[PDB]
Ligand binder design. Structure first.
Ligand SMILES: OC[C@H]1O[C@@H](O[C@H]2[C@H](O)[C@@H](O)[C@H](O[C@H]3[C@H](O)[C@@H](O)[C@H](O)O[C@@H]3CO)O[C@@H]2CO)[C@H](O)[C@@H](O)[C@@H]1O
Length: 94
């Protein structure tokens, strides 16, 4: 079914560590999606995928260095979720 989009905001200048996204979902599910943002007038996507563990938790990490400096916002997208999946929270962490 339908893609789920979550607007995010980050530092435009701090590129230390990892964009860290926590999802809660059906235990043992498969899921995938992206982080999407505009840079230089163009839409760019960094894909993620992962399975929820036995507790229904999924942590996705994307290194910050993959996102150009000067980008401060975009969308976390869920594309495929075998069961249920929600994004509970995100931040840049080291
Ligand atoms: O095929 C993968 C999935 O694609 C989903 O569509 C998303 C596109 O992949 C994504 O590029 C597009 O991005 C938008 C963004 O949401 C918007 O704010 C910006 O203004 O423009 C971008 C488009 O250039 O978002 C869509 C989600 O709406 C499908 O919905 C999904 O079924 C499919 O698996």
């Amino acid at each position: 079914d339908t893609a789920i989009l979550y607007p995010f905001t980050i530092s435009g200048n701090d590129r230390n560590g990892n964009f860290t996204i926590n999802f809660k979902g059906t235990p043992n599910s498969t899921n995938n999606g992206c982080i999407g943002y505009s840079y230089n007038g163009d839409w760019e996507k960094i894909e993620w995928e992962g399975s929820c563990d036995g507790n229904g938790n999924l942590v996705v990490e994307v290194p910050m260095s993959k996102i150009p400096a000067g980008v401060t916002s975009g969308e976390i997208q869920i594309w495929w979720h075998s069961g249920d999946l929600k994004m509970t929270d995100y931040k840049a962490l080291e």
